[PDB]
Ligand binder design. Structure first.
Ligand SMILES: [K+]
Ligand SMILES: [Mg+2]
Ligand SMILES: [Mg+2]
Length: 84
RNA sequence: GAUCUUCGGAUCACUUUGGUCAAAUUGAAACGAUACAGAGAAGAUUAGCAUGGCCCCUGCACAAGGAUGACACUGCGACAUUGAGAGAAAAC
């Protein structure tokens, strides 16, 4: 019964280069190509973050809209906009 | 708000939002490598041009190439049975 709070203060930026020798970015298909397929499942960092309703759920600007949808960033647990 | 008008009002303008889709692991493709075999025509080496399409790739191309691009190239029963004999069975 209290307004929702932002989980992460910062913004997850993108800067990472797999397999430094054998990978090269692809402008059209926005990901790194070349190098060993490496794996189908191996790649799977662990969510650094995690959310729970108890300490995180609350009011937000979208409650007014009847057909509004849930935050893609809340469920994985880094929605940084809070109630806004 | 500007313009007149006479303190009644009139003019002037009048409804956006190009959306492969919300800050990139789990809805834009296609694969590296390692291990196996491993280069068309009836001996051996070898030119090629074709046929077929839910196989494509390079190409501006209705040129031409990719191993002659690759794969494929077969096969069966609208057979009517009687021709006859033998033991059984049922029958001349
Ligand atoms: K040849
Ligand atoms: Mg050819
Ligand atoms: Mg051919």
């Amino acid at each position: 019964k209290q307004p929702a709070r932002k989980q992460i203060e910062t913004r997850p930026e993108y800067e990472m280069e797999p397999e430094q020798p054998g990978q090269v970015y692809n402008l059209w298909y926005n990901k790194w190509s070349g190098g060993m397929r490496q794996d189908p499942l191996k790649s799977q960092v662990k969510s650094e973050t995690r959310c729970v309703i108890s300490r995180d759920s609350g009011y937000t600007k979208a409650d007014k809209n009847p057909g509004s949808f849930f935050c893609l960033y809340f469920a994985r647990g880094m929605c940084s906009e809070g109630s806004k």
